[PDB]
Structures are given as C-alpha cells and as structure tokens.
A paper describes a structure:
Gap junction intercellular channels (GJIChs) facilitate direct communication between adjacent cells and play important roles in various biological processes such as cardiac contraction, electrical coupling, cell differentiation, and death. GJIChs are formed when two opposing hemichannels (also called connexons) from adjacent cells are docked, each being composed of six connexin (Cx) protomers. Cx43, also known as GJA1, is the most ubiquitously expressed connexin protein. We identify three different N-terminal helix conformations of Cx43—gate-covering (GCN), pore-lining (PLN), and flexible intermediate (FIN)—that are randomly distributed in purified GJICh particles.
Since CHS appeared to contribute substantially to the GCN conformation of Cx43 GJICh, we assessed whether the structure would change in phospholipids without CHS (condition 8). We identified four conformationally different hemichannel sub-structure classes, which were more than expected, because only three conformations were identified in the protomer-focused classification. Two of these structures, termed GCN and GCNTM1i, showed similar GCN conformations but substantial differences in the TM helices. One of the two GCN hemichannel sub-structures (condition 8), which accounted for 7.3%, was nearly identical to the structure of the full GCN GJICh in POPE/CHS (conditions 6 and 7). The superposition of the GCN protomers from these three structures showed an average Cα deviation of 0.6 Å. The map density of a POPE molecule between two neighboring NTHs was clearly observed in the GCN and GCNTM1i hemichannel sub-structures. However, that of CHS1 was unclear in the GCNTM1i structure, and CHS2 was barely detectable in either structure. Therefore, we concluded that the GCN conformation can be formed in phospholipids without CHS.
Author numbering:
A (entry chain B), B (entry chain C), C (entry chain D), D (entry chain E), E (entry chain A), F (entry chain F): 2 to 111, 148 to 238
The structure:
Amino acid sequence: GDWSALGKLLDKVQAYSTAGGKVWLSVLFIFRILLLGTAVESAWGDEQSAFRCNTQQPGCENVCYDKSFPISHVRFWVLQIIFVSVPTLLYLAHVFYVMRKEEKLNKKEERGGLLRTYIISILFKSIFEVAFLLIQWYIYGFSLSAVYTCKRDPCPHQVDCFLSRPTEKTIFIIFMLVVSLVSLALNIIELFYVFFKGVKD
Amino acid sequence: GDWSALGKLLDKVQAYSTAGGKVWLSVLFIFRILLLGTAVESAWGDEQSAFRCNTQQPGCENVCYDKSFPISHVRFWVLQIIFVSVPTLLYLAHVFYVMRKEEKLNKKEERGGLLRTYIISILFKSIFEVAFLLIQWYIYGFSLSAVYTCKRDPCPHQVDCFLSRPTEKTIFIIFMLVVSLVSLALNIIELFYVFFKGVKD
Amino acid sequence: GDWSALGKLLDKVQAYSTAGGKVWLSVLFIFRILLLGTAVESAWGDEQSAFRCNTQQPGCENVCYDKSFPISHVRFWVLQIIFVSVPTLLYLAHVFYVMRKEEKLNKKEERGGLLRTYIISILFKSIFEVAFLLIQWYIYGFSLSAVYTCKRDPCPHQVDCFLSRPTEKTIFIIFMLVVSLVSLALNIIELFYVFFKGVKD
Amino acid sequence: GDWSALGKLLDKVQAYSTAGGKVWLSVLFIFRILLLGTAVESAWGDEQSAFRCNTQQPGCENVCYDKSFPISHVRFWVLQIIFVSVPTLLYLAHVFYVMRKEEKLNKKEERGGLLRTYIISILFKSIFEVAFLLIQWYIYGFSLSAVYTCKRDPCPHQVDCFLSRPTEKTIFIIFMLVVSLVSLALNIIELFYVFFKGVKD
Amino acid sequence: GDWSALGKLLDKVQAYSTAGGKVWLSVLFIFRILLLGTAVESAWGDEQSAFRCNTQQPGCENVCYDKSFPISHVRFWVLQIIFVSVPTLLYLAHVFYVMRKEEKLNKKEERGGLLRTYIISILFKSIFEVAFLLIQWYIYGFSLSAVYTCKRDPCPHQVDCFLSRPTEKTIFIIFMLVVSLVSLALNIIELFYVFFKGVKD
Amino acid sequence: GDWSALGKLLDKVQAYSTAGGKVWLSVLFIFRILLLGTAVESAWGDEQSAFRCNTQQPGCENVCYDKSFPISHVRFWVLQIIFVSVPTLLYLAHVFYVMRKEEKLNKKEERGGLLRTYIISILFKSIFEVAFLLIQWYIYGFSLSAVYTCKRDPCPHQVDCFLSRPTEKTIFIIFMLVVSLVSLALNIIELFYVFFKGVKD
Ligand SMILES: CC(C)CCC[C@@H](C)[C@H]1CC[C@H]2[C@@H]3CC=C4C[C@@H](OC(=O)CCC(=O)O)CC[C@]4(C)[C@H]3CC[C@]12C
Ligand SMILES: CC(C)CCC[C@@H](C)[C@H]1CC[C@H]2[C@@H]3CC=C4C[C@@H](OC(=O)CCC(=O)O)CC[C@]4(C)[C@H]3CC[C@]12C
Ligand SMILES: CC(C)CCC[C@@H](C)[C@H]1CC[C@H]2[C@@H]3CC=C4C[C@@H](OC(=O)CCC(=O)O)CC[C@]4(C)[C@H]3CC[C@]12C
Ligand SMILES: CC(C)CCC[C@@H](C)[C@H]1CC[C@H]2[C@@H]3CC=C4C[C@@H](OC(=O)CCC(=O)O)CC[C@]4(C)[C@H]3CC[C@]12C
Ligand SMILES: CC(C)CCC[C@@H](C)[C@H]1CC[C@H]2[C@@H]3CC=C4C[C@@H](OC(=O)CCC(=O)O)CC[C@]4(C)[C@H]3CC[C@]12C
Ligand SMILES: CC(C)CCC[C@@H](C)[C@H]1CC[C@H]2[C@@H]3CC=C4C[C@@H](OC(=O)CCC(=O)O)CC[C@]4(C)[C@H]3CC[C@]12C
C-alpha cells in the first residue's frame, strides 16, 4: 500500500489536459514503442550483408552503400522518439521536485506558474516532430526503388546496385508516417483546446 | 495487501461479458502470444539466406525474393495481434480514468454510458480480424509450393527459385488460420448474446 | 503479507488429487520445461547449415531437406507441451472465477459440479499426449540414420544426404519418449484412483 | 514483512544436517551453476564450425564429427546437475506439503517419518553423481588430443581430423571433475555423520 | 510503505545543488545511457567483417585495421561514462554510511564536512570529462574518411583500405561531442554557483 | 517495511572493517564486474574467426591457435573474480547462520570467535589474487605482438600467424592489472590496520 503518492503525482500532472486526449496519446506512444521494438527491427537485420552491386572492383560496394544510405531509418526513428519523449520527462521531474518543495514548506509551517511550461513542452514536441518529418521528406522521400545508380569514386563511371525487400521497408515507412501525423494532429488539437479555454479566462 | 483496487477494476470491466467467454478469450490470447513468441519465430530465422535461384546473373535473386514475398507472415501476424489487442487496452484505460473521476467526485461530495463503447470495441475487433483474414487470403493464399517462377527485371525471361521448409510454414499458417477463426467465432457469439439480452431490455 | 488468497486457491484446486501425485507431476513438468529450454535447443542450432548432399545440381538440397524433415522435433515438442498444459490453466481460471463469484454472492448475503471438469481435463491430457506419441511414432519413428536417400524433383534419380550428430538427437528423442511415458502413467494412475474412489461413493 | 513462513520452512528443512555442511554445499552448488552458465558455455560456441578434416570427399566430416563426439560435455554436465538437484526439490516440496497439512489439522483442532526420506535423497544424490562420473570416465576419459583418426563410412580407409582449443576444454573438464569429487566427499561425510549419530540413538 | 528512508537519503544528498540543475543533469545522464545502449551499439556491429583492403597479401588487412583503429569509440565512450559516474556513487555511499553512523550515535544517546567532498567530486567529474574530450580530439579527431592509406609491415609500400558507413559514425561522434559539451557546461555552472554562494558566506 | 533484518546483518558483518575501506572495496568490485560484463567481452567476440596463418596446409591454423592461446584471458579473469568473491559469501552465510542460531537460543531462554575467520578470509583473498597475478605474468606476460611464430606439427618447419586488435587487448590487460594491484593494496592495508589494532589489544 504505497501507491498514493504516485497516484497524486499522476493526477496533478494531468490538470489542464483533456479528458480524452490522455488515453489516446498514451496508447499511441505505447503502440509506437512496441512496433519499433518488436518486429520492424528484424526487418533491418541484414542492411549491408545482402546489398550487392554489379561490379568487379573491390571496395566500390562500401562507398556506394554509404552514399545510398547516409543513415538508417531505424536509428532516425529512435532519435525522433527519444527527442519527442524527453520534454514530458523534464516536465514530470520539474513538477515532482516543486511538489516536494511545497510539501516541505507546508510541513515546516504546520495563472502561468505551471501552464507556461506545459505549453512550452507541447510546442517543443510539435516543432520537433514536424522538423523530423520535414527532414525525412527532404532526405529519403517516401519511396524506395530496388535499383540504384552509384557514381562515386573509385567506382568507374556508373554502377548499379540492388537493395533488399524494398516493399516491406516502404510499408513500414508509411506506417511510421501515419503514426507521426496522428501524433501531430493530437498535439495540435490539445494546444488549440488549451489556448481556446485560456482565451475565455 | 494492495490488490483490492486492481480486483475492483477487473470485476467492473467484466460487467456485461458472459461468464464463460472471459476465460476462453483470455486463454486464447495467451496461447496465441505464446505460440507466436516461442517457436514459430525461429522457423523464419533463415528467410533469405537459404533462398536460392537457378541463375548466374548477380542481383536477380534479390528482386525475385522481393517479388515472391512482399511481406513476411510473422510481422503480418504481429500487426494483426497488436491491432486486435489495442481496443481492449483503450477500453480499460477509459473505464479506469472515468472510475477515478467518479471516485474523486464522490469523495469531494461526501443505459449506454458504457455498453456503447463495449459494443464499439467488439465490432472493431471483429472487423479488423476479418479484414486481416481476407487480406491474407487475397495476397498469399493458404498454400506454399517449393518451386517459384520469377519473371522480373533484370532477370532474363523466366527463372526458377526454391523456398525452404514449405511444409512447416504451411502447417503454422493453418494453425494461425484456425486460431483466428475461433477468435472470430467467440467474438460474434459474445456480440450476439449481448444484443439478444439488450433486445429484451 | 498478501499470499493468503493464493494459498487458498492453491489448496482448493487440489481437492480430489492424490497426496503424492501433486509433487511428482509438478516436478515432472518443471524437469520437462527445463530440459526443453536449457540445452536441447542448442543441439538443433544448426539444422540446415551443416546438412549437405552429394550432388552438383543447385537447389536440390533444399527440397531434399524439406522431404527428409517435414517438421523439426523441437517445435513438435513445444506444441505437445503447450497442448498438455492448456487444460490445467483453463481449469484453474474457471475455478478462480467461480470462487470469486461465490465470494461475492456470500458477501452480498451476509457431486459433479467440479469433479466432472477435473475428469474431463485429465482425460483430455491423456488423449492428447497419447495422440502426439502415436503421431511421432508414425512419422519419424525413434531412430535416425546418418545417411538418407532423396528421390524428389528436380534431383536426378537418387541422391545421398548426410545429417548431423544423429546420436545426440536419438538420445534426446528417447529421453522425451520416456518422460512422456512417465507422464501418461501418472495421469492414468490418477484417473484410476479417482474413479475407484468415486465407485465406492 | 512476509518472510516468517519462508524462514520457518528453511529452518525446519535443515533439522538433521550438520552446522557446517549447509553453507559448504550451498556455495558449492552456486559456484557450479555460475561456472557452468558464465564462461564455459562460450568455450563450446564453435563445436562444429571450426572442426575440419583433411579430405576432399563431401559429407565425411559430418559422420567423423558424429563418431568423435557422441555427446557434448556441456549438455552432459547440465543433465548431471539437474539430476543431482531434483531430489532436494522433491524433499522440499514434500516437507512443505506435509507441514501445511499438519498446520491445517492443528488449526481445525484448536523416528523415521522424515529422516528416512532424507537418507534416501542423500544416497540417490551420491549414486547419481558417482554413476555420471563413471560414465564420463568410460566414454570420454579425461584427456583430449588435437588429432583424431576417423575410420567410418563413406570415408575411405582412414582420415585425420583436428579439434579446437583442446587445452581449455581439458582444463575445464578437470575443474568439473574436482568439483564433483568435492561434492561426493561432502555428501558421503554428511551420510557418515548422520548414520553415526543414529547408531547412538 | 518502505520508501521513507530512500527519500530521506535522496533529499539529504541534494542539499547544496541548484533547484534546476538536478533534473537537467539526471535527464542528460539517462539520455546518454539510453542512446549508448539502444541503437549506436548496432552501428558498430560490423567493425572488422566489412573492412576490406585492396591487396592480395594475406594478413595485411589485420595489421592495417589495427593501425587504423587503435581503439573502438564505443568502448572509449563506455569508459568515459563509467569514469564520470563513479564519483557520484562514491559520494552517495559515503554520505549513506556517515548518516547511518550518526543515526546509531543518536540512537545510543537518546562548514566543509560535506561540501568539500561535493566540490572534489564535481571537479573530478569536470577534469575527467575534459581530459577524455582532449584525448579524443588528439587521437581520432572528429571526422572520418572512407579511404585510408596503410604503410605498415608486412604490407608492401602503401595499400588502400575502405571503412564502412562513415557518415553515420561521424554523426554519432558529433552527437556524443555535443552531449559531453552540455554536461561540462552544466557542471561548470554548478561549480560557479556553489563557489559564488560560498564566497558570500 | 521489511529491511530491518537486512540492515542488521549488514552492520554486524562490518564490525572490524575500516570506515573508509568498505566503500572503496565495494565500488572497486562494482567497477570490475561492470567493466568485465559491459564492453571488454565484445572485444573477444572474434577470437578465432579473424585469426589467420600464412600457409596452405589444412588444419595447421587450429593447432597453431591452440598453442598460441592456451586459455582466453576473459575466462581467466572470470575465474579470478569468482575465486576472490567466494570467501566473502562464505563469511556472510556463516555469520548469518550463527546469528540466527543465537537469536533462536535467546528466544528460547527469554576475542577470536569471528575475527579469526575474518582474517582467514582476507588472507585467502590476498593469496589468491597474488597467485593469479603471478600465473598471468608467467604464462602470457603483459604484451602482445601482432606476429606469432608457430612450430607445431603437422605444420612444416615454421609458419607465421597474425592476431587481431592487439593494442586494445593490451590496454584492457593493463587496466585489469592496475585494478588487481589496487585491490591487493586495499586488502593488505586492511590487514595491516586490523593486525596493528589487535596488537594493542
Ligand atoms: C520501466 C517502465 C515501463 C516504467 C517506468 C517509467 C515510466 C514511469 C515512464 C517512462 C516513459 C514515460 C512516458 C513517456 C511519454 C509520455 C507521453 C506524455 O504525453 C502527454 O500526454 C503529455 C503530458 C501529460 O499530459 O501528462 C504522457 C506521459 C507519458 C506516457 C510518460 C508516462 C510515464 C512513463 C511511462
Ligand atoms: C507485463 C504483463 C504480463 C502484465 C501487465 C499488462 C496486463 C495488465 C495487460 C497487457 C495485455 C492485456 C490483455 C490484452 C487483451 C485482452 C483481451 C480482452 O478480451 C476481452 O475479453 C474483451 C474485454 C473484456 O471482456 O474484459 C480481455 C483482456 C485482455 C486479456 C487483456 C488483459 C490485461 C493485459 C494482460
Ligand atoms: C512466471 C511463472 C514462473 C509463474 C506464473 C505462472 C504460474 C502461476 C503457472 C504457469 C504454469 C502453471 C503450471 C502448468 C501446469 C501444471 C500441471 C498441473 O497438473 C496437475 O497436477 C493437474 C491439476 C492439479 O491437480 O492441480 C498442476 C499445475 C501446474 C504445475 C501449473 C501450476 C501453475 C503454473 C506454474
Ligand atoms: C529464482 C531462484 C534464484 C530462487 C528461487 C528458487 C530457490 C528457492 C531454489 C531453486 C534451487 C534450489 C536449491 C537446489 C539445491 C540445493 C542443494 C541442497 O543440498 C542440501 O544441503 C540438501 C538438503 C538440505 O540439507 O537442505 C540444499 C538446498 C539447495 C541449495 C536449494 C535451495 C533452494 C533453491 C535455491
Ligand atoms: C537498477 C537501476 C535502474 C537503479 C538502481 C541504481 C540507482 C539507485 C543508481 C545507479 C546509477 C545512479 C546515478 C548515477 C549518476 C548520477 C549523476 C549525479 O549527478 C549529480 O547531480 C551529482 C550529485 C547530486 O547532485 O545528486 C546525480 C545522481 C545520478 C543520476 C545517480 C542516481 C542513482 C542511480 C540511478
Ligand atoms: C542480484 C544482486 C545484484 C544482489 C543480490 C546479491 C548480493 C546481496 C551480493 C552478491 C555479491 C555480493 C558482494 C560480493 C563481494 C563483496 C566484497 C566484500 O569485501 C569486503 O569488504 C569484505 C567483507 C566486508 O568487509 O564486508 C564486501 C561485500 C561484497 C561487496 C558483497 C556484498 C553482497 C553482494 C552484492
């Protein structure tokens, strides 16, 4: 029977949030982490072993693979999720510490103080997710072709290379895209609601 | 001695369900997850290493494997199970939050409100499972042959490829099919019972 | 100090069982699962990598391996153990739920009802284990030879193939066989005892 | 504060044992399991990949490896340790159940009964460990040579094969041998003490 | 309900630290360990398997790889993080032991004593992190080129070698660099604050 | 709230030890185990796969590798740490059992007894660590060269072999050496202190 303080912190951290938004956002986060950890990781098990190019020059395949894939999508998604998860942890730690400070102050002596930080965290999450989506659109796009052309030294003129299981990777990319879009929509809806309620004072 | 609240939530979430259906559905879910995680995963350990085609052109085997298997069945099953498991988690979280809200309201002051969401969750589970079954029937069918014909560029005209342990994969596919059929039958029986009882008011 | 209810359920679920049979069956189950998970799994680490056939035709080894081994014994044993473990879990869940229902009924108001299901579970376990043993006898037998003859297309006429470490696999097969025989004997002894006691009323 | 019953069972199960023998036997068991699980397992990581024979006939190396090593020592040690650990678990379960039965009997009503089983367990442990040691002496001996001669079909006349890191395996075999000898000595000392005390009545 | 002593130790160990610095430093440490353990480790999965040099002499690639990479960056980062984490653990253990000693002393009898050690720990952390950064700058720099020249025996004159995915490794190196810079800035800010407050007495 | 007995045992087992030595020794042990388990294990991931010798005779590389490395350093370090950790566990178990015996004796009835064993454990730890260090100095030394000469049958006259990443292994060997030296110094300081205090009576 030592769950009262945890419940108190949980209910105090959810003051200004919508009744429905909490469950949707939590289950979306859980779905994202489960999908990232369970099966999509094995799809990128063989990123370079099965990658072959049609040439005889040794060492050309390494540089061609480097140029084709500047960074694997799995680690990009990991960075995205950790960067969208950090601000909530910061907010939780800050509110926990200030609550303990207030508890000590009231034990010894037996708007905007919190909403501003909440809005800052929400806008940071939104801007980070939209920036990551824009970067992914700019670098890789949202389609993969099984044939790639490589024109980097020391490979002569042009060479051809083939990827592995492009359809599966494309499907998973689309899934991550739609999940991120849903997350952005939920965050912007929450921000609109809180701002609309704050206008009415 | 901190299990009273968990038991209260567990008994409150099982209000309108049948006496017998709960145990059957729970053990079916446990059997499905155990079978998916324990042994069937190792059967797909070598999906592309042992896959060989009878040709000398480099790079043809990659595209032939891509065309033969647009998506591995294991990850399809993982997506199916997570999509049929999410709505129950949503329902549980929603009922937990509303119960906490009612507890706070009654502490400070010392049909269809829930059945509609229950029916929505049941119908969502049924439609998702039947849609996944229909998609699996449409794409892969329910039989695998050890010999496949590939007619994709840059392979000349037609080439032949061989899979690995098709009989074992076919057996596991049939097992998953019958498990899904049992799940659908249980869900439709529960829906029929609850609707029949609701007709009598 | 929250183990009283678990102990109550444990002692209530063991009403009609013999004093000695409980420990023997439990330790047999633990021994079986430990042996299956600890060391025998590594013996089947290389099932197809070390399997070689004496031919030059590409792709013949895959179909020959498929025909030689329709299904690996490890996954067959996993299916057998899960199918002999499910009915006990069903019985436990059912008795737990009915006990909670009776507790609620008696709180608000401050033979064959269970033996039939017990006998059904025992007979189901016995019939499933004997069926699995019969299937294993019919398909694989209980001996493995290091040399196998393959006569399947597209391999010409007949080819020869060699397995790996047949003696170790044979020893483990014999071990699993004797364990299953002991389990069947214990189950039939329990059934005989309970029926003999029920005859005397 | 729910450790009183566990302590009661622990002190009741250690009635007739020596004051010093308990700690020595327990730490010996812990040392054995830690050594088996931590580092010696990796030494047998490459049992067949690095095993090479000096021939050109395909498939001869498989049968030669099978004949050279009928069973890996690691799994033999696992079987030995599980077979010497089971009887103590049986004794603990039996004494726990009879203690619960006596507790229920005394709640409702508010030598050789145990020593015989104890001696049976001790003698079973001793006979099993000595039998395993004798079998290991009879089959593998206690020395490994880096060169082995194979005279099994279909290899012509005689062929030569080489093992991997024989010195390390020999050292670990000697370590397991001395640990087993210490265990046997401790068990026989305990049996001698208990019999000598029982003679005096 | 056994968390009071842990909370007491946690609040006593955070006496002289800033209100804001605690959460920032803790979340920075958590982010660092999560990034090190989650995804960056897999990027160095193939450090030597994919490393190829353009030559025919056997054994030259080993020495060229040894000369190119005196030590992998992952283990260097592990050493850095463990060396910057040890002093805080030492401080925590020391304060815990002295608090227990004082508790015993006061039970039986029913500035600079701690700040000096705190400052020592802070300066040790700062000097260790700056030393590690300087060493990394001196040895590897902060850029990797896909082509390397090797001039070590027994390779004739000069040979060329190619690395793998240099861009990803460079990105992760930059990430670790900026994280370390942030950590150093936070530590120096904390030291400046505590010294400035100690000047005023 | 069930930590009082554990704290009592912890404070009673630390009677004669120095105030400062406890934390230093504990953190040294934690650092050693963390370093052994975290990163140094992966450095020996490829001990035999990358080891190549300049010859054409099959099977010579196996015996040359066996002669070059009689035993891997990682398992030697594991044996060293387990052998220096066992005596403390023995002392803890013995003091726990005698404390329980005294508690039972005083409940029913409502120098050198411990220091000798403490000194025995300390001297055993010191002698074991110094013996392991001497053995490591005698067998492997403290330096590794990338080129090794092999003169064992059936290799003709002399052959040359190359190791992998010798610099990293040398650095880790030096690290383990200095850690062991620090441990020996701490143990001898503790022994000197306790003997000096015991002289004064
Ligand atoms: C070992 C794990 C399984 C449990 C211990 C860690 C948890 C207490 C932490 C880790 C990650 C946290 C989550 C990280 C991100 C978010 C998104 C966050 O989104 C919001 O709705 C914004 C803040 C709010 O409205 O509460 C809600 C909290 C949540 C689910 C956090 C809840 C608390 C979690 C589960
Ligand atoms: C770490 C794990 C082992 C325990 C912590 C998580 C559990 C509390 C959750 C995770 C998955 C949940 C299950 C996911 C899906 C379902 C199907 C669901 O199906 C129904 O019968 C519909 C709803 C109902 O009638 O209760 C019943 C609840 C159950 C078993 C859930 C029960 C609660 C579970 C076990
Ligand atoms: C995470 C694990 C280690 C603990 C949580 C799960 C256990 C509470 C369950 C899982 C598997 C169950 C076992 C599965 C099969 C059987 C065989 C069954 O056989 C019988 O004797 C028939 C029924 C009876 O007489 O009780 C006895 C119960 C037992 C050991 C079950 C006891 C309860 C177990 C250990
Ligand atoms: C998950 C694990 C770490 C804890 C849960 C299981 C333990 C409660 C069991 C598992 C294995 C058991 C051990 C298996 C074998 C033995 C040898 C046995 O040898 C004897 O001295 C004979 C019997 C006696 O004199 O008590 C003593 C008990 C012991 C250590 C057992 C003690 C209880 C153990 C640790
Ligand atoms: C099994 C794990 C997940 C929990 C058990 C171990 C923790 C109790 C320890 C392990 C590592 C420790 C951390 C290691 C390093 C630091 C940095 C340290 O930096 C400071 O702010 C300096 C000291 C202070 O101001 O408190 C703060 C404590 C913290 C987070 C420690 C807090 C306590 C931790 C989490
Ligand atoms: C699952 C693990 C993380 C916790 C359960 C096991 C611990 C209770 C044991 C396992 C290893 C033990 C350690 C092994 C070796 C030593 C060295 C030993 O060195 C001394 O200072 C000598 C004895 C003393 O002065 O106390 C101190 C105790 C300690 C840290 C032991 C403390 C208790 C430990 C952590």
